Amino acid sequence: GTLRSTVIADGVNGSSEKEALVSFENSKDGVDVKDTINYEGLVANQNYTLTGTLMHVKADGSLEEIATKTTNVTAGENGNGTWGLDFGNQKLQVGEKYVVFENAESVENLIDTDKDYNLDTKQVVKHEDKNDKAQTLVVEKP
Ligand SMILES: [Ca+2]
Ligand SMILES: [Ca+2]
């Protein structure tokens, strides 16, 4: 299973090649932060707990949690599709970089890990890549 993500910051999307650039003007009333999560290789019609974390990237490369959103979601027809997380309006600061991390954990056991054809382990998929520009926003200087 995989998760991929796109941050949408004041209506500006991240991409693999370019962080979402949020103008200082846009940031003055806070930054509306949403995230769309493309999942593949999950189990069709099964419930997952989806956790998104908006991380502030500090000068030393360490991360601190700004916002967290947890939803209860269901995998599609064929175990693939898109979920969303709306973090709402966030008070993000000029010159700073923020990145969205995502985790999905099946509510039930979905994996047999000991060849007895009984399910014993949850499926866990994560995307925790602070270098993924598609998940990254930067607040620009005035
Ligand atoms: Ca704004
Ligand atoms: Ca088993």
Side-chain angles (χ1 to χ4, degrees), residues 1-16 19-76 78-142:
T2 61
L3 301 182
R4 294 298 180 262
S5 65
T6 303
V7 70
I8 308 92
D10 273 346
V12 178
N13 60 296
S15 78
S16 60
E19 303 90 343
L21 300 179
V22 179
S23 70
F24 176 71
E25 195 67 44
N26 276 353
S27 83
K28 284 178 167 186
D29 63 350
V31 181
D32 301 311
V33 181
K34 298 186 181 64
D35 196 84
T36 62
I37 305 96
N38 290 351
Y39 60 89
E40 298 281 343
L42 301 193
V43 185
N45 315 132
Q46 308 313 295
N47 291 303
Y48 291 76
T49 306
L50 176 65
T51 307
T53 309
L54 180 62
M55 293 292 200
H56 173 222
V57 184
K58 296 158 54 181
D60 70 0
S62 71
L63 302 193
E64 60 182 351
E65 174 178 317
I66 297 301
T68 181
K69 183 144 180 81
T70 301
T71 63
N72 209 274
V73 292
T74 309
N78 283 105
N80 56 63
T82 307
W83 296 318
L85 291 172
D86 186 354
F87 295 89
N89 190 94
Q90 298 293 147
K91 303 309 179 174
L92 307 188
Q93 299 304 316
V94 64
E96 299 300 314
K97 184 167 53 172
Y98 307 82
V99 61
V100 187
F101 284 8
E102 310 75 43
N103 183 96
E105 175 180 291
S106 62
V107 177
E108 293 189 338
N109 292 147
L110 291 181
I111 302 171
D112 175 23
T113 65
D114 57 7
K115 302 185 169 57
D116 73 352
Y117 288 76
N118 283 248
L119 304 176
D120 59 72
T121 296
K122 293 172 182 187
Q123 181 179 30
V124 176
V125 185
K126 67 188 51 159
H127 188 64
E128 298 181 336
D129 183 358
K130 72 179 185 181
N131 303 311
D132 182 358
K133 292 192 184 52
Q135 298 290 15
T136 304
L137 74 94
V138 178
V139 183
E140 299 185 295
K141 291 172 167 183

